[PDB]
Amino acid sequence: LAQQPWVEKYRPKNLDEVTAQDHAVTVLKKTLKSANLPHMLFYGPPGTGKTSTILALTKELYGPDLMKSRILELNASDERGISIVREKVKNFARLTVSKPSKHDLENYPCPPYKIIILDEADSMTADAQSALRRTMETYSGVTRFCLICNYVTRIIDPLASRCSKFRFKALDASNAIDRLRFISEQENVKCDDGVLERILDISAGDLRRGITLLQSASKGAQYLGDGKNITSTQVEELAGVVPHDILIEIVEKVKSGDFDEIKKYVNTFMKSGWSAASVVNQLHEYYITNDNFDTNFKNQISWLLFTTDSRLNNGTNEHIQLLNLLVKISQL
Amino acid sequence: ENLPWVEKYRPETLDEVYGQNEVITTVRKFVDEGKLPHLLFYGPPGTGKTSTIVALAREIYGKNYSNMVLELNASDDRGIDVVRNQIKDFASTRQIFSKGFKLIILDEADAMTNAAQNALRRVIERYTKNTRFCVLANYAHKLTPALLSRCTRFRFQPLPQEAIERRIANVLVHEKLKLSPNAEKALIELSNGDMRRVLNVLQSCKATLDNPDEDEISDDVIYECCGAPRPSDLKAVLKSILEDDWGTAHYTLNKVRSAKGLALIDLIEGIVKILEDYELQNEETRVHLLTKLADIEYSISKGGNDQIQGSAVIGAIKASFENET
Amino acid sequence: VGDKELSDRSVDIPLPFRTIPPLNHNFLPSDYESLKDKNSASCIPVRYQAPVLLGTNIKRNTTLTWPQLFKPVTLKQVLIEPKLKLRIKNWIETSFHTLEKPTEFVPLMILHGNSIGKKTLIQTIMREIAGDDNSYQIYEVNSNMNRSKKDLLDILLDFTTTHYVKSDYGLVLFNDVDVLFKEHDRGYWAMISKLCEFSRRPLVLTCKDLSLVPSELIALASEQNSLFHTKKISTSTVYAFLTKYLKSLEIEVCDDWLRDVVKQNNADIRKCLMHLQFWCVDTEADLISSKNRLPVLTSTLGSSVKDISQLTDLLSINDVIGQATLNRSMVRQEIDSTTMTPEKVNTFQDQNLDDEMKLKFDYVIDYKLHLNDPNRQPLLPFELNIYQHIQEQLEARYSYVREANHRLDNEYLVNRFKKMTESTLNFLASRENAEIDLLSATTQQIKAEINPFVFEIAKSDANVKNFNADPSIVVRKWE
Amino acid sequence: SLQLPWVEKYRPQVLSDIVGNKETIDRLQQIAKDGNMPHMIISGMPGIGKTTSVHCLAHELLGRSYADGVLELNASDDRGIDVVRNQIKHFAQKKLHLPPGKHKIVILDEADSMTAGAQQALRRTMELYSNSTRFAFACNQSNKIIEPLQSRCAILRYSKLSDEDVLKRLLQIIKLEDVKYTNDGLEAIIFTAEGDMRQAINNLQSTVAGHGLVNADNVFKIVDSPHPLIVKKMLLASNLEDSIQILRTDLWKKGYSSIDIVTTSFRVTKNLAQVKESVRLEMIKEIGLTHMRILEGVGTYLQLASMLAKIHKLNNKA
Amino acid sequence: SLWVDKYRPKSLNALSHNEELTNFLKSLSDQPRDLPHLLLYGPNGTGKKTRCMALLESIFGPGVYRLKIDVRQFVTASNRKLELNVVSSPYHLEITPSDMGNNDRIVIQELLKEVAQMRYKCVIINEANSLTKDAQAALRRTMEKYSKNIRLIMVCDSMSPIIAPIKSRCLLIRCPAPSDSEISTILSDVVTNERIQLETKDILKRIAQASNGNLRVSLLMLESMALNNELALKSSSPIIKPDWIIVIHKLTRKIVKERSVNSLIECRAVLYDLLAHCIPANIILKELTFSLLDVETLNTTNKSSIIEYSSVFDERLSLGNKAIFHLEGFIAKVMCCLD
Ligand SMILES: Nc1ncnc2c1ncn2[C@@H]1O[C@H](COP(=O)(O)OP(=O)(O)OP(O)(O)=S)[C@@H](O)[C@H]1O
Ligand SMILES: Nc1ncnc2c1ncn2[C@@H]1O[C@H](COP(=O)(O)OP(=O)(O)OP(O)(O)=S)[C@@H](O)[C@H]1O
Ligand SMILES: Nc1ncnc2c1ncn2[C@@H]1O[C@H](COP(=O)(O)OP(=O)(O)OP(O)(O)=S)[C@@H](O)[C@H]1O
Ligand SMILES: Nc1ncnc2c1ncn2[C@@H]1O[C@H](COP(=O)(O)OP(=O)(O)OP(O)(O)=S)[C@@H](O)[C@H]1O
Ligand SMILES: Nc1ncnc2c1ncn2[C@@H]1O[C@H](COP(=O)(O)OP(=O)(O)O)[C@@H](O)[C@H]1O
Ligand SMILES: [Mg+2]
Ligand SMILES: [Mg+2]
Ligand SMILES: [Mg+2]
């Protein structure tokens, strides 16, 4: 009421209002005009607009008052694949449509079958090779299930056989800039040039991450009370990204080749509090993209960086891994 | 009619079950002799265990099939107590029957627990004379060895190329579709002995055609409906990694990954499968490539960021194939 | 919709296309016989001498079970400490004297502990005080019947109110008060409360752990000093009792096997007599191996440091593999019905569930909430276990690996930490807020920094003793 | 009609015919001859002859009173708290006259599946009625039975059957059944037996029914597991490409799961004798790492390929 | 009543160092209606937990610092005595996940369900880096579904092992270690509050460098120094260290001076002595490594090998059960490389 998260406040309520994705929106509006869709999948970058797309589809298919009744949202959550998902689906299938509203007559198709949304149900402790098969075969005319995933890594071909696979392409920079600037100007966010590109680079095209970062930056600017435009440094700090000057110092230290100097600099830098994973990622970005290094050097440093990142992801001590990685880079 | 082809083209008798031959010959020997022990079909899904056993049961049980068999499922909403009660009530009854030898159709035993399996084998012990059990599973390592020792263990292997091609030839004339040779080759390569997968791909391709009467189906249509990486794209990625510079190889890999939405894993096994056909001058190249790719896949399974893993894959492949050069 | 410029092309960077030779198999019996499993020297079954039965003893040709055959008749043989026996006998006789007078005295016990003779001692006391087997009458309450209020309330009141048809040495004895069923034993603690209010005969409750009995009952028992705690007996005394029992049977036995039996049976008198009853028949067969000996141990120094370094690396990889594989089973395991599952507790919370269904699935009343992970389950014995195989292979030629297998335990280093923390709490008290704050603090930094500094402070204050008092506890715990 | 399987047709009806664990079998025979049957919990791997042993013991103890002196509680019949509280108590309270030394028998096979509460109620009714009836447990895992039951029973840890007793019993069955045998076939049967005597009998019966003469290849044609000889050649090949070819064709394309391949490779490495003990331990460690990676979820062809690469490196170098 | 305890700040304005973070926390506490999920990361002993307690005190009131101890007992499938002392308050809750081990998914889920069953109740999670992947996924699922009564505030040493969605749905707050001038100021405040007779302020500076950016270690050093000399610190009083650090230094000296198998046996005995006194293996490996790196008679390649072996065996330790095997393996590897 008082506040709405901008990730869910500015969702596209209209299917045609969704930025880009013409090849998806045209086919889905044709499908809803056909008033029937099968159990179908999505695949694309996380936060590309899958949940927003299905919400717009069921908004233009069902009624606003029927939102909380016909739609029963079971994503990858406390719901367990064989424990409470199955019983909820069954008692919802026994449940019928409530009373129709005045605006849902002759405007929205409101078909008898329900729509059940499962977000990332593949990554669950229960393998559903045929869990929903009989409950969408016997209850085909009264319910329908839509599954949402990231990649095309289908585990079981049953339960995903009659699949209308539509692809969300990666969000281009222009439309992301336009939408995020529209959100900022609706929320009177004061920012100067070069910032929005920094958020989109940090989020790597994830608009939900970008929207949350923009909201956090606006909150920080308002809490500061200065009223000045948000700078990029606050955005980097809010995302854990190490500043570029420190990365320049790190690469200078590893180019120097002195062991004691590298150890001392690592010891001083672990008191700064910056995460080592961000350091490894920025080292990868600075090294692999650069064209001033030989093929053998990049071949060795890629494996070294991968090993260090894998060790860091295993919940190990960051100082020792970072020191080993910097020393190994120096020895290259 | 307007039904999925999975249940439409089930083998009505043992003669239409292709691919598997030794088990069917053993079944024919059993029926000719008259000995029907406890059976156990397991293997990859889609090999036709359920189809083979339903054909067996129907051709033995004629018209009172609908009464004197009972098809069970361990994964339904009944529970261990309810399945035990059902088995005891169906075995200890001796209803109105022409011939005995009650048959149990118990599917998906891989989810059965140790106590449930012990109860099942004890019921098998108690009611062997009147009831025969043909519990069905898929993985043999998820079943207690006490249950394996009381059933005639029959492993099921994926269907070979000739049987799949013969069934495609049978289907196309009935459904008045036609497939190009490259399309059939790609389909049987991606099938990996999964028959239901093949039928669903065929029905999806028929539904995809604007005029499903005389339109030809290509490799692109099957590869996009099934959701499998195209060999040409992976070959292009491999050649960009090998003969091109670091920046352009990374650009091509990222562009292909974004366009086709394939995971780094499936790319790794595709690269391994393509490189296995080719030969290498040195063996240390193959050793290092396999070890590094396995480590990369293992690290990807745990989690992390994809960019450094792609860079690691490219670097490992480059180092391996410059070791031999 | 779908557009791409990429076209089908052939890769030519590697070597030209490899010709694939088929690999036929023509195995011969000369290599088939190589499948003979090599004799595994890791297994070390050692034999012991056969027992020689001396004479023809009447006790040898008995019908009753040996723990019942060697049942104590007085208060000297029941294996329990003498102070506790004297205290409980004095309480019993005082209660019998007082309850004869028409009646502030509530006869009540919690005979908690980890000993074995928690029931026969009361019977021996009854034999001593009554002087005859038929004089006393004990209503021994077990877990084999229903301990529900509506099924036993009137019976227990009638037994504790009126006389017994035949000095009426009556007593009510409650075995297995640690185990309670939520619905089968519904209203049980109400039964104890009602009996304790309306009592004229002693009530004795025996258990394993004190926490099951409600706290008000603990307070009532402690007010009358009727809370008796029993402790397990050391291996020396029980070994002496077994030797006395065997020399009463006139059977010659070696001391090593008896020591091994006592060690492996956790010094349980019933278990030891049961094992000796099973394993001392008049037969020529050898005895059980008990503790396995050294399976051709070659625990050398490893000579060069390379060999020991490789062995240590192998041990580390073994530990990693075992930690990964000992809690991942492909076969799903059943969940015990008579166990306090949080889902089962939540189900019983709902009042829609009627009595008939409640009796169908009940649980043991416990103060511990039993959680479990369906995906993460222990390995079954028939499942593949590489970790165990490599561990038994390495321990067969290196004793220090076997030492490390039991030098540190999961229960250990945790009770030690608790003891160190309570000693630190006492020291910091000896100069509330710290009581809650240090427990709020992460235990890792407690292990790291605060404890050694507390030791430094304690030893500094002890040096000048020879700002805080009583520093020797921190010194001895850190020792 | 039906033919009686040799696992049940040649089941020993007496304790003397049961091989393996000679000390425990002899002690059980002495107990049956004299009397005063103790409470024991027979524990061990399945298929080693525990249920048959306890049934033969009950037979030899009672004789004609088998039907009314033994109450058998298996997983098929309900064994809840009400069962222990009512029918076991009534059977213990039943008045059955026996010759001196004998007692009523209460057998609870697969006792590892018992609920905790049923076991808790079981200890008191077995302690109080120990003068008239005796209990006998037979469970695969001894840790599933709570401590109070083990404190009132002499736990029997039946060991795995060796090769000599299984081989001699198979020779006896072959002699009494007129089966043509060969040494390699018997060795293959023992190799696939794993001490599982029921498995060995079933394999021999299936070999006789299907392929007639019992040869090693005939035995390995019905075991429906990865071939130990093919796996041995695949592990011991001097060329890595040959090993990859073998695992791709005869193992991966034939439907053999990764778990079965890993288990067979571990068994082959354990059976190895030509290579050094340290090299064998290194291969076993590598196979354990591969099993780790499969249990984590990565049961892919690439993991087996990498395992073969490192095994081949170990064989070629060092 | 320890000095580190009794001189812990209990209000937002009482915070001395990191003035920008203090102002940020004050402005977050200005509006009590919205508290986004916070993930405080940084070096140990820099005031992350103190800052969280100060923020909770400011947003709710004085009742936050009234902490109570509740003992919760759990049993897994292996029947192990899993005990967790959940620290509770009338306004928040504190949970330490690493005290349970692998079962940090089921225990956390049960605790969150129990708390949510009863405007919002804060749950404080210490050392969030120790959470397993399934536990982190369960926490992420709790964040979205239970975003009304439960607001997760996690304090961790390192934010690297956390999953990406948790980073996405949290306000990342970094707590850098204070500069040595700020540690000197805090120690001077303690001295002028408790009247420690200092001949010079250089002692506080030396303690600040010896604490290598850790406030609690510096405070404990001041405690031990003051209680050693009885409020009479001089310059000649040496910088003392905990006994385990000294034994580790002696172990590295023995390793670098002796080359024998019996030396490895003595090292195993010393590791047994260290572990038996309940010290975690990660910090033991850290101190042992960083004292082996400070040996003057070692060249660059040997030190690089030492750091590589330390990293590899840290990887093994983070995925292992018995720390003695991994530590002995690291000792053996550096032992063979030292030849
Ligand atoms: N085309 C779009 N136009 C405007 N906003 C968009 C668009 N696509 C996504 N968003 C925003 O991004 C948010 C999250 O993206 P979605 O993919 O719709 O949700 P999601 O599927 O839950 O994301 P993930 O995969 O769970 S991270 C939405 O709530 C919108 O606010
Ligand atoms: N050898 C075969 N010949 C002809 N059709 C086959 C064959 N194997 C499978 N099929 C068909 O493929 C589909 C698979 O059906 P099922 O036999 O029920 O699958 P399954 O092999 O039992 O595996 P699951 O996943 O455990 S049901 C059916 O439409 C069968 O008719
Ligand atoms: N010296 C002894 N003192 C006490 N009991 C003995 C002694 N020697 C043998 N026993 C047997 O030990 C058993 C102890 O009594 P039980 O009733 O079986 O156990 P309990 O006292 O109920 O305690 P539990 O079994 O731990 S619940 C009896 O069967 C006795 O016959
Ligand atoms: N040593 C043996 N000598 C003779 N027959 C044996 C031997 N061991 C097992 N058998 C036979 O092998 C089969 C195994 O049956 P059981 O004894 O019931 O198996 P088990 O050892 O009790 O383990 P289970 O039943 O899987 S829990 C029976 O036919 C036995 O007669
Ligand atoms: N702003 C501050 N001013 C003075 N002392 C502080 C400040 N922040 C933290 N401290 C000191 O830190 C100690 C607590 O550290 P803590 O927050 O537990 O570290 P961590 O967050 O690493 O667990 C307190 O005793 C307090 O004296
Ligand atoms: Mg989503
Ligand atoms: Mg089926
Ligand atoms: Mg059995």
Buried b (16+ CB within 10 A) or exposed e, D147-176: ebbbbbbbbbebbebbbebbbebbeebbee
Within 8 A of E133 by CB-CB distance, chain B residues are 302-303
Distance CA(D99)–CA(D102), nearest Å, equals 6
Helix, strand, coil fractions of chain E, as percent rounded to 5: 55, 10, 35
Q: State how far Cα A322 lies from the chain centre.
A: 28
Distance CA(D81)–CA(D117), nearest Å, equals 6
D249 is in an annotated binding site: no
Question: Are E191 and E326 in a shared domain?
Answer: no
Q: Reduced to 3 states, what is the DSSP secondary structure of residue D249?
A: helix
Q: Determine the distance separating the centroid of ligand 3 and the alpha carbon of C119, expressed in angstroms.
A: 6
Instruction: Enumerate residues 100 to 139 of chain D having a beta carbon within 8 A of any beta carbon in chain B.
Output: 109-110, 113
Identify whether E140 is part of a domain: yes
Return the closest-CA partner of residue E75 out of E109, E108, E103, E115. Answer: E103
Q: What single-letter amino acid sits at D199?
A: Q
E45 touches ligand 5 (CB under 6 Å):
yes
Closest-approaching ligand to the CA atom of A179:
1
Return the closest-CA partner of residue D12 out of D62, D74, D54, D73. Answer: D54
Cβ contact, residue pair C184, D81, below 8 Å: yes
Which residues is B278 bridged to in the sheet? C17
Supply the DSSP symbol for D154: E
Compute CA distances D211 → B151, D1, D196, whole Å.
19, 22, 22
Helices E261-276 and C305-325: crossing angle in degrees, nearest 10, is 30
As given in the structure block, the two tokens for residue D1 are 């009609």
Q: Reduced to 3 states, what is the DSSP secondary structure of residue A43?
A: strand
Return the closest-CA partner of residue E288 out of E261, E326, E231, E260. Answer: E326
Distance CA(D158)–CA(D138), nearest Å, equals 10
CA distance E247 to chain B (A): 37
Q: Reduced to 3 states, what is the DSSP secondary structure of residue A116?
A: strand
Cβ contact, residue pair C37, D191, below 8 Å: yes
CB D53 within 8 A of CB D18: yes
Question: E strands along C199-312, which residues?
Answer: 203-205, 229-230, 251-252
Distance CA(B242)–CA(B321), nearest Å, equals 8
Can you tell me which atom of ligand 1 is nearest the CA of A21? Answer: 1
Q: Reduced to 3 states, what is the DSSP secondary structure of residue D134?
A: strand
Compute CA distances B190 → B5, B84, C11, whole Å.
19, 40, 20
Within 8 A of D140 by CB-CB distance, chain C residues are 381
Distance CA(E54)–CA(E58), nearest Å, equals 6
Protein residues within 5 Å, CB atom, of ion ligand 6: A 51, 119
Supply the DSSP symbol for D142: G
Distance CA(B89)–CA(B87), nearest Å, equals 6
CB A99 within 8 A of CB A51: no
Question: Are E205 and E255 in a shared domain?
Answer: no
Return the closest-CA partner of residue B240 out of C35, E209, D88, C9. Answer: C9
As given in the structure block, the two tokens for residue A307 are 């090993």
* A10 contacts: CB under 8 Å, gap ≥ 6: A183, A186, A211
CB C143 within 8 A of CB C261: no
Distance CA(C127)–CA(C77), nearest Å, equals 13
Query: Which phi and psi (to 5°) does residue C252 adopt?
Result: -85, 130
CB E168 within 8 A of CB A208: yes
One DSSP character per residue, B72-124 reads: EETTSSS-HHHHHHHHHHHHS---S-SS--EEEEEE-GGG--HHHHHHHHHHH
The DSSP element (H or E) to which B264 belongs, if any, is helix B264-277
Question: E strands along B82-186, which residues?
Answer: 102-107, 131-133, 152-155
- Domain ranges (residues) in chain B: 1-159, 160-228, 229-325
Distance CA(E82)–CA(E73), nearest Å, equals 6
The DSSP element (H or E) to which D106 belongs, if any, is strand D104-109
Within 8 A of E41 by CB-CB distance, chain A residues are 240, 273, 275
- Kindly compute the dihedral angle of the four CA atoms of residues C74, C78, C84, C90, in this order, to the nearest 10 degrees: -20
Distance CA(B194)–CA(C26), nearest Å, equals 31
* A33 contacts: CB under 8 Å, gap ≥ 6: none
Residue D120 CB neighbours (<10 A):
24
* E78 contacts: CB under 8 Å, gap ≥ 6: C378
Which of E2, E67, E131, E155 to probe the C interface (max C CBs under 10 A)? E2
Q: Reduced to 3 states, what is the DSSP secondary structure of residue A226?
A: coil
Q: Of the candidates A123, A314, A320, which has its C-beta nearest E310's C-beta?
A: A320
Tell me the count of B-C CB pairs closer than 8 A: 66
Buried b (16+ CB within 10 A) or exposed e, A69-80: ebbbebbbbbbe
Structural domain count, chain E? 3
With an 8 Å CB cutoff and a minimum of 3 pairs, decide whether chains C and E touch.
yes
Interior CA angle at C403 toward C399 and C408, to 5°? 160
Cβ contact, residue pair B302, E163, below 8 Å: no
CB E252 within 8 A of CB E288: yes
As given in the structure block, the two tokens for residue E67 are 């902490």
Distance CA(B114)–CA(B40), nearest Å, equals 17
The DSSP element (H or E) to which B5 belongs, if any, is helix B5-8
Distance CA(D310)–CA(D17), nearest Å, equals 48
Distance CA(E257)–CA(E267), nearest Å, equals 13
As given in the structure block, the two tokens for residue C51 are 């027992």
Parallel, antiparallel or unpaired: strands C251-252 and C52-53: antiparallel
How far apart are the two ends of chain A, measured CA to CA in Å?
57
Distance CA(D119)–CA(D130), nearest Å, equals 16
Distance CA(A115)–CA(D64), nearest Å, equals 68
Which residues is D72 bridged to in the sheet? D107
CB B23 within 8 A of CB B154: yes
Question: Are E169 and E187 in a shared domain?
Answer: no
Identify whether E38 is part of a domain: yes
As given in the structure block, the two tokens for residue E86 are 């959940």
* E323 contacts: CB under 8 Å, gap ≥ 6: E275, E281, E317
Compute CA distances B52 → B17, B47, B57, D166, whole Å.
7, 9, 9, 36
Compute CA distances A322 → A261, A316, B218, B305, C474, whole Å.
14, 11, 51, 17, 38
Question: Are E54 and E147 in a shared domain?
Answer: yes
CB D153 within 8 A of CB D41: yes
The DSSP element (H or E) to which B40 belongs, if any, is strand B39-42
CB E94 within 8 A of CB E86: yes
Q: Of the candidates A220, A271, A312, which has its C-beta nearest E213's C-beta?
A: A271
Question: Are E315 and E195 in a shared domain?
Answer: no
Tokens 């898929």 appear where? Answer: B138
Helices C451-465 and E215-229: crossing angle in degrees, nearest 10, is 0
Distance CA(D304)–CA(D290), nearest Å, equals 7
A44 is in an annotated binding site: yes
CB E95 within 8 A of CB E86: yes
Can you tell me which atom of ligand 5 is nearest the CA of E43? Answer: 22
Parallel, antiparallel or unpaired: strands E150-156 and E171-174: unpaired
Residue E293: give the domain boundaries.
243-338
- Secondary structure in 3-state letters for C175-211: CCCCCCECCCCCCHHHHHHHHHHCCCCCEEEECCCHH
Distance CA(A285)–CA(B294), nearest Å, equals 24
Residue B288 CB neighbours (<10 A):
20
Distance CA(D301)–CA(B84), nearest Å, equals 39
Tell me the count of A-B CB pairs closer than 8 A: 115
Q: What is the CATH number of the domain that holds E54?
A: 3.40.50.300
Cβ contact, residue pair E159, A272, below 8 Å: no
Indicate the burial class of A19 (C-beta count within 10 angstroms; 0-12, 13-18, 19 or more).
middle
Question: Are E13 and E145 in a shared domain?
Answer: yes
Distance CA(A142)–CA(A135), nearest Å, equals 10
Within 8 A of D259 by CB-CB distance, chain B residues are 139, 141
CB A156 within 8 A of CB A127: yes
Question: Are E167 and E36 in a shared domain?
Answer: yes
Helices A295-313 and A318-331: crossing angle in degrees, nearest 10, is 170
Q: What is the CATH number of the domain that holds E191?
A: 1.10.8.60
Supply the DSSP symbol for B110: G
Distance CA(A166)–CA(B224), nearest Å, equals 10
Helices A244-256 and A276-289: crossing angle in degrees, nearest 10, is 70
Distance CA(D34)–CA(E159), nearest Å, equals 72
Distance CA(D61)–CA(D59), nearest Å, equals 5
Best probe residue, ligand 3, of C206, C270, C271, C275 (max atoms within 8 Å of C-beta):
C270
Supply the DSSP symbol for D38: P
Distance CA(C417)–CA(C477), nearest Å, equals 10
Residue A192 CB neighbours (<10 A):
11
CB D82 within 8 A of CB D109: no
Return the closest-CA partner of residue C399 out of C309, C304, C298. Answer: C298
Residue C287 CB neighbours (<10 A):
21
Within 8 A of C279 by CB-CB distance, chain D residues are 27, 154
Resolution in A: 3.7
Can you tell me which atom of ligand 4 is nearest the CA of D52? Answer: 17
Compute CA distances D36 → D39, D105, E27, E211, whole Å.
10, 11, 83, 74
Q: What single-letter amino acid sits at B251?
A: Y
Residue A321 CB neighbours (<10 A):
26
Question: Are E298 and E205 in a shared domain?
Answer: no
Q: Determine the distance separating the centroid of ligand 2 and the alpha carbon of B195, expressed in angstroms.
A: 6
Return the closest-CA partner of residue A136 out of A204, A53, A40, A209. Answer: A40
Return the closest-CA partner of residue C200 out of C232, C230, C235, C162. Answer: C162
Distance CA(D125)–CA(D86), nearest Å, equals 11
Considering Cα of A56, then A60, then A64, then A69, what sign does the dihedral take? negative
- HSE of A14 in the Cβ direction (CA atoms, 13 Å)? 4
- Domain ranges (residues) in chain D: 2-161, 162-225, 226-316
Which of B102, B269, B290 to probe the D interface (max D CBs under 10 A)? B290
As given in the structure block, the two tokens for residue B65 are 């099939």
Indicate the burial class of E65 (C-beta count within 10 angstroms; 0-12, 13-18, 19 or more).
middle
The DSSP element (H or E) to which D124 belongs, if any, is helix D116-128
E178 touches ligand 5 (CB under 6 Å):
no
Residue E162 CB neighbours (<10 A):
25
Nearest CA in chain E to A272: E176
CA distance B154 to chain D (A): 7
Distance CA(C305)–CA(E335), nearest Å, equals 8
Considering Cα of E243, then E247, then E249, then E250, what sign does the dihedral take? positive
Q: Of the candidates D255, D297, D303, which has its C-beta nearest B294's C-beta?
A: D303
Distance CA(D206)–CA(D203), nearest Å, equals 5
Considering Cα of C338, then C339, then C344, then C350, what sign does the dihedral take? positive
Best probe residue, ligand 1, of A207, A211, A213 (max atoms within 8 Å of C-beta):
A207
Cβ contact, residue pair C316, E1, below 8 Å: no
Parallel, antiparallel or unpaired: strands B102-107 and B69-73: parallel
Can you tell me which atom of ligand 2 is nearest the CA of A130? Answer: 25
Q: Reduced to 3 states, what is the DSSP secondary structure of residue C138?
A: strand
Compute CA distances C364 → A184, C351, C361, whole Å.
60, 19, 11
Q: Reduced to 3 states, what is the DSSP secondary structure of residue D300?
A: coil
Return the closest-CA partner of residue B250 out of A153, A285, A309, A282. Answer: A285
Q: Reduced to 3 states, what is the DSSP secondary structure of residue D265?
A: helix
Tokens 């059955």 appear where? Answer: D96
